[PDB]
Amino acid sequence: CPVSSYNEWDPLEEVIVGRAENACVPPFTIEVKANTYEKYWPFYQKQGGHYFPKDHLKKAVAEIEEMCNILKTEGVTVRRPDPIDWSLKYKTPDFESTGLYSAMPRDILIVVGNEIIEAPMAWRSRFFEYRAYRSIIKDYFHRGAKWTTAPKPTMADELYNQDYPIHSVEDRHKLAAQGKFVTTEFEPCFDAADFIRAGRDIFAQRSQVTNYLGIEWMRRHLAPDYRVHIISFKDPNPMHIDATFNIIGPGIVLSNPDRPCHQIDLFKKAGWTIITPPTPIIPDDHPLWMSSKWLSMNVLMLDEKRVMVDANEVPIQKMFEKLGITTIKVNIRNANSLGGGFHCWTCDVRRRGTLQSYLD
Amino acid sequence: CPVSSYNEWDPLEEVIVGRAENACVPPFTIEVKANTYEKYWPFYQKQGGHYFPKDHLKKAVAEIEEMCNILKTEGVTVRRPDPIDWSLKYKTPDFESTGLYSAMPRDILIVVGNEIIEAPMAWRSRFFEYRAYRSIIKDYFHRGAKWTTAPKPTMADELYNQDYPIHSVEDRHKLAAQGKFVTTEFEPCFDAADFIRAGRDIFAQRSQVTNYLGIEWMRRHLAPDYRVHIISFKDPNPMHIDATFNIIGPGIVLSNPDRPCHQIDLFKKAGWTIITPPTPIIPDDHPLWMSSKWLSMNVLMLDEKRVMVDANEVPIQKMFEKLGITTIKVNIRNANSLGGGFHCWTCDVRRRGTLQSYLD
């Protein structure tokens, strides 16, 4: 069976790497607003529905191609999604929208054991995103893999607080603290990237795009073999956990200094090594349409001692080096603008290893 | 000035479409042998000097007329070459031969900017082929266009390896790999179709009919404004590049899966999108006297989002459709037998646009 991955560090053998092609700026709706920095709101407001700057896309295509070259050199089989024009405007009985991209396979696909799961998503512009990955998935299915699609939301107005009182990322942090997000508990919704795997235990966070109902669906679906845990952080990332709490080995985790985990003690009690990465050196003038500067910690482990880290981020390179982990430096500075780093731009389909517990 | 075309995708306004009339089977000489499949060698051997099957020609005439109708509907001005009897036997001080046809304007004319260039050709049966296009060209010249005729070869025996050790297309692929072609470097020779335009950069391949001297002449003639590059492929097409590496937009190229480009990385580095088309569905029983089944990828771009593709080739139709490109399906199944698809049967004289670089 081609699909088999229980965690984020076992020897990587196959991966899916996204595409920057035809990436389209999402229309400026409430959920887009709640998941981006104020600095970019007028960008979304004006560019919505058009393609992201093509000169920028062209550089990202190049960076990602090089990344694929390096993976193949490191002995990893690379699969890529189908090219699709994301500008097409579709219409469901609940809404009408243009698409986004298929740059981040981690946002939509998660692999637990021999099973590939497609997330429902929570953004209207990402409703038909699964279309780009179906060729790959059907192939794995024909070859024995289990295939699951979580319940696709209707994404009707009832799923969103159209009145989410956010005027700055400062307001959003406060609301998040109060337990208030842009998504209601109207129906299950989630991004696969809000879940991070560690064998028998998976960790998730209720975020702007992943609600309690969505986590419950995962929990109920994977039990009894896996335990999904809910953890929280201070000033959390509006969406996705992989640049906030990135698990890099059996009991080692990168905890973003700016988003401390409220349940950090559960990990200290387990005898886990909490590593706090040094600050990103990326220039503040460089555009990050989604995400933040902390993409520097969004690393991909080829194995326990080999990490694919950004070529520009020298300080975090040294940290890995003092730890005895070989750094494979790749530059994806323009690809970063789309919203992700190495962990985001990939989905590990097969890692050589077995199911185990690391929480004892 | 009626002539103005810098690439293969800007909004098409004027085109020259070939004729199937009086097409004549070329005598079976060494260069014909090196540019056709073994299956057809006895056809050339027996039919040489006579017309291609008239019942077949009649169907091609009909198909091409419909194509012209569709172009006019799409707002393109269509010009056609003069009707000529290709059976006439001519004699130069170097050889004697009967002619071929004027079906493929792409084989003989190339437009770079405001300049129309007539290629020298490398086949004896195509020595006086330019005669069919002179009425059109003189008109453009009277209207301001620049007109150039590359040095017409003598086509003496010294230009051919009369002993080219080819017994199958398998042998030819091996020889081509060794850098051995049926044409020597005795004098410049080339088919315009071995060059494909992308603004300031033009790409060419040393082929069975286009030698290094021919490419050098082009390079020396077009410099400094244009850079002609030489690229190569595995198991290349004996002649012409447009069904091996068809550039369909600013940074998008169709790379024939069976003829991979040795310099593909130069393009990946530029941030270019390499698209690999699905396999042709044309029946193996259908005669293709020249060329191959890959004529399916020999598409013509009316603009960046409109492509004239074969009505029968459904799989490649879908590919364009998922990319957001409107397909204009036309059936030219019998016209294909003569050696070309849409790109071959035409020569874009005017495309609305400017000279630019896409290789950065």
UniProtKB/Swiss-Prot annotation, chains A, B:
MF terms in GO: amidinotransferase activity; glycine amidinotransferase activity
SUPFAM superfamilies reported for this sequence: Pentein (SSF55909)
Consequence of substituting C347A: No effect on activity
EC number: 2.1.4.1
Listed result of changing R352Q: In CCDS3; benign; mild decrease of glycine amidinotransferase activity
Top class in the EC scheme: transferase
Consequence of changing K39N: In CCDS3; uncertain significance; reduces glycine amidinotransferase activity
Consequence of substituting H240V: Complete loss of activity
Effect of R350Q: In CCDS3; loss of glycine amidinotransferase activity
Catalytic activity, as annotated: L-arginine + glycine = guanidinoacetate + L-ornithine; 4-aminobutanoate + L-arginine = 4-guanidinobutanoate + L-ornithine; beta-alanine + L-arginine = 3-guanidinopropanoate + L-ornithine; taurine + L-arginine = taurocyamine + L-ornithine
UniProt effect for mutating A145T: In CCDS3; uncertain significance; loss of glycine amidinotransferase activity
Listed result of changing A122P: In CCDS3; decreases glycine amidinotransferase activity
Annotated consequence of substituting D171G: Decreases glycine amidinotransferase activity
Result when mutating D191N: Significantly reduced activity
Cellular component terms (Gene Ontology): extracellular exosome; mitochondrial inner membrane; mitochondrial intermembrane space; mitochondrion
Family, as annotated: Belongs to the amidinotransferase family.
Function recorded in the entry: Transamidinase that catalyzes the transfer of the amidino group of L-arginine onto the amino moiety of acceptor metabolites such as glycine, beta-alanine, gamma-aminobutyric acid (GABA) and taurine yielding the corresponding guanidine derivatives. Catalyzes the rate-limiting step of creatine biosynthesis, namely the transfer of the amidino group from L-arginine to glycine to generate guanidinoacetate, which is then methylated by GAMT to form creatine. Provides creatine as a source for ATP generation in tissues with high energy demands, in particular skeletal muscle, heart and brain.
Disease: Cerebral creatine deficiency syndrome 3: An autosomal recessive disorder characterized by developmental delay/regression, intellectual disability, severe disturbance of expressive and cognitive speech, and severe depletion of creatine/phosphocreatine in the brain. Most patients develop a myopathy characterized by muscle weakness and atrophy later in life. Fanconi renotubular syndrome 1: A form of Fanconi renotubular syndrome, a disease due to a generalized dysfunction of the proximal kidney tubule resulting in decreased solute and water reabsorption. Patients have polydipsia and polyuria with phosphaturia, glycosuria and aminoaciduria. They may develop hypophosphatemic rickets or osteomalacia, acidosis and a tendency toward dehydration. Some eventually develop renal insufficiency. FRTS1 inheritance is autosomal dominant.
Name assigned to this protein: Glycine amidinotransferase, mitochondrial
Annotated source species: Homo sapiens
Upper lineage: Eukaryota, Metazoa, Chordata, Craniata, Vertebrata
